Amino acid sequence: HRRLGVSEELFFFHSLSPGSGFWLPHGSAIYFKLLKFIREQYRARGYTEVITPNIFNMELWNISGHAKHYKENMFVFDVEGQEYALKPMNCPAASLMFDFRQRSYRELPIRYADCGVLHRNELSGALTGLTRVRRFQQDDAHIFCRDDQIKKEVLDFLSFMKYVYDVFGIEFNLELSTRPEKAMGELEQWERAESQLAEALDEFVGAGKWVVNPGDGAFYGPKIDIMITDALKRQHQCATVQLDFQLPIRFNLKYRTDDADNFKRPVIIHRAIYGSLERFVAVLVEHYAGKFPFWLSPRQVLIVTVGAAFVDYGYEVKDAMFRAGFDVDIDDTGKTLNKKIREGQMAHYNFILVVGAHEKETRSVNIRTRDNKVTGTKTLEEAIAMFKELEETKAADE
Amino acid sequence: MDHRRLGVSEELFFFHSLSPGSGFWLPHGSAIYFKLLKFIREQYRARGYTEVITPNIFNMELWNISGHAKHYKENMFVFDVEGQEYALKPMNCPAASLMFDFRQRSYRELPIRYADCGVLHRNELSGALTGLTRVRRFQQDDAHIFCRDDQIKKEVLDFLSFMKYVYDVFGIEFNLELSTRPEKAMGELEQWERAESQLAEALDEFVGAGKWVVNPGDGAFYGPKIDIMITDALKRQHQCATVQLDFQLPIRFNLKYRTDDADNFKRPVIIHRAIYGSLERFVAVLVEHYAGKFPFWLSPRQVLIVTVGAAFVDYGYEVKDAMFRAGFDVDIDDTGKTLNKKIREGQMAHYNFILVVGAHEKETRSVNIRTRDNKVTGTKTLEEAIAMFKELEETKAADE
Amino acid sequence: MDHRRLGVSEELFFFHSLSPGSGFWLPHGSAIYFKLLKFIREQYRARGYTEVITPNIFNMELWNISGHAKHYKENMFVFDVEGQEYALKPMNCPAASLMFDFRQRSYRELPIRYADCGVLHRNELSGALTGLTRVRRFQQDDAHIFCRDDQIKKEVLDFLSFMKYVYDVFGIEFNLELSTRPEKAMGELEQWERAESQLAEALDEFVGAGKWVVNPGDGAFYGPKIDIMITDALKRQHQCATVQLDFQLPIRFNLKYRTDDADNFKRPVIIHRAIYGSLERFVAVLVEHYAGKFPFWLSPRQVLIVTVGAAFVDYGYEVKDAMFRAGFDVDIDDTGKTLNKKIREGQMAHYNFILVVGAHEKETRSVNIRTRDNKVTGTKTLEEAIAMFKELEETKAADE
Numbered sequence A: 001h002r003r004l005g006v007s008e009e010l011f012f013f014h015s016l017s018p019g020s021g022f023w024l025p026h027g028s029a030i031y032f033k034l035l036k037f038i039r040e041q042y043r044a045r046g047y048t049e050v051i052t053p054n055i056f057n058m059e060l061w062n063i064s065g066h067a068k069h070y071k072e073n074m075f076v077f078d079v080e081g082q083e084y085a086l087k088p089m090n091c092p093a094a095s096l097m098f099d100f101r102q103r104s105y106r107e108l109p110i111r112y113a114d115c116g117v118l119h120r121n122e123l124s125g126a127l128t129g130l131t132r133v134r135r136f137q138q139d140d141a142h143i144f145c146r147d148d149q150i151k152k153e154v155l156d157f158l159s160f161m162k163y164v165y166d167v168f169g170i171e172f173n174l175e176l177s178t179r180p181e182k183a184m185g186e187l188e189q190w191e192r193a194e195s196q197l198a199e200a201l202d203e204f205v206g207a208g209k210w211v212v213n214p215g216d217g218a219f220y221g222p223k224i225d226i227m228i229t230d231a232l233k234r235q236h237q238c239a240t241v242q243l244d245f246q247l248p249i250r251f252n253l254k255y256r257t258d259d260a261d262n263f264k265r266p267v268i269i270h271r272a273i274y275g276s277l278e279r280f281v282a283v284l285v286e287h288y289a290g291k292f293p294f295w296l297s298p299r300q301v302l303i304v305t306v307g308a309a310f311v312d313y314g315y316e317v318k319d320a321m322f323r324a325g326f327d328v329d330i331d332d333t334g335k336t337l338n339k340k341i342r343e344g345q346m347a348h349y350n351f352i353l354v355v356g357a358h359e360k361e362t363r364s365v366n367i368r369t370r371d372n373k374v375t376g377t378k379t380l381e382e383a384i385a386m387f388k389e390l391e392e393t394k395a396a397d398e
Numbered sequence B, C: 001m002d003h004r005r006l007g008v009s010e011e012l013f014f015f016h017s018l019s020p021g022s023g024f025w026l027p028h029g030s031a032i033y034f035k036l037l038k039f040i041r042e043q044y045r046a047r048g049y050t051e052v053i054t055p056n057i058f059n060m061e062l063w064n065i066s067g068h069a070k071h072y073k074e075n076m077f078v079f080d081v082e083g084q085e086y087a088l089k090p091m092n093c094p095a096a097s098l099m100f101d102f103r104q105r106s107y108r109e110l111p112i113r114y115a116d117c118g119v120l121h122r123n124e125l126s127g128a129l130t131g132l133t134r135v136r137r138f139q140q141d142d143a144h145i146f147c148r149d150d151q152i153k154k155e156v157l158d159f160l161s162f163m164k165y166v167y168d169v170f171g172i173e174f175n176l177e178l179s180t181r182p183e184k185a186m187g188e189l190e191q192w193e194r195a196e197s198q199l200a201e202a203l204d205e206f207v208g209a210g211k212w213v214v215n216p217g218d219g220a221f222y223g224p225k226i227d228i229m230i231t232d233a234l235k236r237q238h239q240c241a242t243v244q245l246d247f248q249l250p251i252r253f254n255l256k257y258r259t260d261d262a263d264n265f266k267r268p269v270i271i272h273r274a275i276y277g278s279l280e281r282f283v284a285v286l287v288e289h290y291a292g293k294f295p296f297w298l299s300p301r302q303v304l305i306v307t308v309g310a311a312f313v314d315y316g317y318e319v320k321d322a323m324f325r326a327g328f329d330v331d332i333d334d335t336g337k338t339l340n341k342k343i344r345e346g347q348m349a350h351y352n353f354i355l356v357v358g359a360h361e362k363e364t365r366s367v368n369i370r371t372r373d374n375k376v377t378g379t380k381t382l383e384e385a386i387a388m389f390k391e392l393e394e395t396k397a398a399d400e
């Protein structure tokens, strides 16, 4: 069906910035709602969102390993004779934030969310739509925990992830990817960590129903491989849980351990659910075929006027809908009523509200669904109450 | 060179969830794809290439011999036939070798240029499939060039010339670089130096000495490469063309030629080469490059006839029939809409030419031509108008 | 009457143990295959067909819908993609449906004729796979036609006419049978009747009441068909052509068209049709049929130039080049061999013409012509000769 084609005013691309989206108002509306949902959860689940820089001195990248492993994918420039790069990952700035002041063990775990803009270089010809972009924002958060806290942190992540996915009807599958041949930890770290990942997995999924990919871990840590399935039965990688034993060392991260004096290093968990906002929108656009659910739709309500006489009343309905918080439009024109309705359905509006003489006199709306079902005439108060519930509950169509 | 892009995709092809990553080409798209094939084939004939036809599925032992098993298995669709491992072909490059090995060949015979347009398959994750840029299924304009060591410069020079010729038709620009023996490599040094020397020489020639860049150590482990990047009207860069030499594949398949006399056999050098890169990919480039407005020869919507009135329809259909016989891709609007709408609706559809027919025109037995960008070419007779269209096609003319 | 006559007949094509059941078409072979495709493609354009391109692998859910999963699975190659079942297509007939369903279609459009020349695989047991007659891999000249039920007789009549026309070119003969509704059939009765009546009517018009036969109850469960049998010069009978209606095919895929400019929809009829049957198979037929002596238009060895002396070789290449530029497949023997030998050798290799060039010919810009079947034509100017060859090609002339 086409992420890009479905640009009935969601997003576009221009040759002056290939790989970077232009999000039109209706497009933005979706992006923002997704952010608002993720943020509502972050607050509920113990995360604090932080803001970080976008350009850094190459020295940061040297420390991280990005200079070694990633440089080809980065936008590199000169500042005052010094090499600088646009950030491809938030994952190092987050470490600096954690090192800002000394941390005690009781504090674990610290969870920082970052919605910052990332850049990765890709060849211009290679770029298409939102699937392969230069510019994106991850729903990134990087979690710092004690070694004993891994199972709970992972378990908690899985619920968060599941909770989100459930909202959209999206399926997932989990595997454990274990230590590779070239790997940088001590054995002790890997065993404790993998054991916990297993434990979390056998609690979340239960003993039997998860495969292991032995030796498929990152050099820097063990991971749980997540794959998601859309309604067309395509698979995407959106979610991650990746442990990192390297980054804590490189940035010299520590927490004071009760009796200390001494200190220990935290484990870092790089994690995401959307993967990026850009990527997730692309998935959803196709997954719903451009028929979004009422909460996330940028075209929630359309008012259609029966005749010129009821047009002012329509503007009244629209005002009320807008104040109540809805994305609402009004047809307004001399077009035939049947036409107006059909067009609105074509536009994908979740609800069409026809207002005639009856509605005006009784302060009500006559409601038609996207699917052309005939919900009842309802009063304005009743309609608003209905929409709120749909919104609040994040109800699906199906 | 400044516009909003229109990637995947305007509608000449589509994709279905039942085969994600594999195109369905609608009649207008197919027409383009077949037109490209025809052009390359016309060139192949003129330039010493013979197109061959090969199998699509092979036993894994082939891939074992090739190196695909070690390096590529991950991207292959692999399956069982009667207990034996099999795979759909990622590349033609191995079957071509077997063709070379069919019968004994002599040095006089070089260079044997075999072209293959066969369907290839590579595995890619479904989520990550979008458009024609990343597909499971594609057809390369692939062509292997089996040659003597002494023959590389000419064959490469000949290739570069073919490539430029094709690209110029489309207004496409290119940049050439040389990539040289890497640290981990498989051949003998001599074959590498002789080859790289011939390559530089080819570059000095065409591009000019000191005007081209070297990427030292950026070649493949099985041979030197000329790295090519092409640039479209939007200033985007693509990898479509390739020249890659291969010393491994000839060993693996035990390829030989008889040298003058019977002293010895020598192994040929292989050059894996391409210009379109793949038909699916080239189209995707062209669609953007032209912004949906193809040049007359290549357009699936060359001529649209529009009728002023009903007394006129018969004349148009007659006109339309003449255009069709003449070989043109022609459509008609016999509907009753007001003219300006007809013209505008057609222009929107990117018809190269709109042919307007009125009472005078019938009687005139002639035609009134409006160009795509709205220019009033003014009326003409049939036989001439055709002659004029025929000429744009024969010459492969670009628009204004 | 004489030994026969395929597989061994060279050069043309070969099989390898790495892909049994899949042909390797050597250049002389490909040349034949391409010509056949090109002939069929010319006819398609002339006859309202549009060729399209389709995917080669599909999720199993497509085959479940079509009936392939029930009926055909053991004849298919099946593999896993991302944990889901997939198969290589044994038929194009289902992809064509998806194409039809891409956009709403109207009574105005009918009939819709989509040609597909795509690659198909069927999983035959390896021991059974001999030659081109029984292969894993093939390209059909498939077209699956979409029409209103009232359009059947006219469409079938048009097909028969197209088919006779192709066969006539080769001197090939046909016989027609009608297979009617089986005991276990799936239609509504009416549709079968209406259809069967139309078919009989086309048959009556095409060949007359006398000349066709009926096989009652030999129809497919999903449709009535016309059996076509063709006869070669050796009096061997082949089935290549078919016309098979399908009533199931459209229900399964929920196909419809708008009948009016109101609110009403009907299902189309599908006709799965072929003439060559497969390109691999039609070649096998033609090789035997001609005994390797192909008519000039289709020959991969049209002209051989033979030189009388060393002093004449350069004029000879001059001749060869002109011949090639003219579009002919042409070779030269510049060997030291006796002229009488060269000629006999060319004739054995089956070249249609031998062009003898000597001093008078070089002096005159002439050739001295001998046919395949010996037979001495005499002298022509290089121009006359090319014009003569052009006529034979253009008309697709038989030797007799």
Ligand SMILES: C[C@@H]1C[C@H](C)C[C@H](C)[C@@H](O)CC(=O)O[C@H]([C@@H]2CCC[C@H]2C(=O)O)C/C=C/C=C(\C#N)[C@H](O)[C@@H](C)C1
Residues within 6 Å of the ligand: A064, A065, A066, A067, A069, A070, A089, A091, A092, A218, A220, A240, A242, A244, A246, A247, A270, A271, A272
């Ligand atoms: C500099 C190294 C690059 C690495 C080898 C690149 C690989 C292709 C791959 O490992 C990247 C990866 O899986 O990152 C994944 C991220 C999480 C979201 C998806 C992926 C994302 O952002 O794309 C996690 C790692 C972040 C890592 C670090 C930092 N700093 C590492 O400590 C450091 C060793 C990375």
Ligand SMILES: C[C@@H]1C[C@H](C)C[C@H](C)[C@@H](O)CC(=O)O[C@H]([C@@H]2CCC[C@H]2C(=O)O)C/C=C/C=C(\C#N)[C@H](O)[C@@H](C)C1
Residues within 6 Å of the ligand: B066, B067, B068, B069, B071, B072, B091, B093, B094, B220, B222, B242, B244, B246, B248, B249, B272, B273, B274
């Ligand atoms: C099995 C090996 C896989 C190779 C190492 C994959 C690399 C990513 C890369 O080297 C592929 C490549 O450059 O192929 C390029 C092809 C040519 C057209 C574009 C590219 C194409 O078709 O994509 C050509 C190489 C074909 C090579 C072989 C064969 N047989 C080699 O002898 C064999 C050793 C290759």
Ligand SMILES: C[C@@H]1C[C@H](C)C[C@H](C)[C@@H](O)CC(=O)O[C@H]([C@@H]2CCC[C@H]2C(=O)O)C/C=C/C=C(\C#N)[C@H](O)[C@@H](C)C1
Residues within 6 Å of the ligand: C066, C067, C068, C069, C071, C072, C091, C093, C094, C220, C222, C242, C244, C246, C248, C249, C272, C273, C274
């Ligand atoms: C799944 C079913 C298999 C069928 C019962 C197998 C039989 C052996 C025979 O019926 C096949 C046949 O006659 O096909 C003939 C084809 C046409 C060219 C030659 C023959 C060819 O390609 O071999 C036509 C039917 C294609 C049909 C379908 C599709 N999709 C049907 O709607 C579907 C019900 C077919």
Ligand SMILES: [Zn+2]
Residues within 6 Å of the ligand: A089, A090, A091, A092, A142, A270, A271
């Ligand atoms: Zn990270």
Ligand SMILES: [Zn+2]
Residues within 6 Å of the ligand: B091, B092, B093, B094, B144, B272, B273
């Ligand atoms: Zn190759």
Ligand SMILES: [Zn+2]
Residues within 6 Å of the ligand: C091, C092, C093, C094, C144, C272, C273
């Ligand atoms: Zn069929």
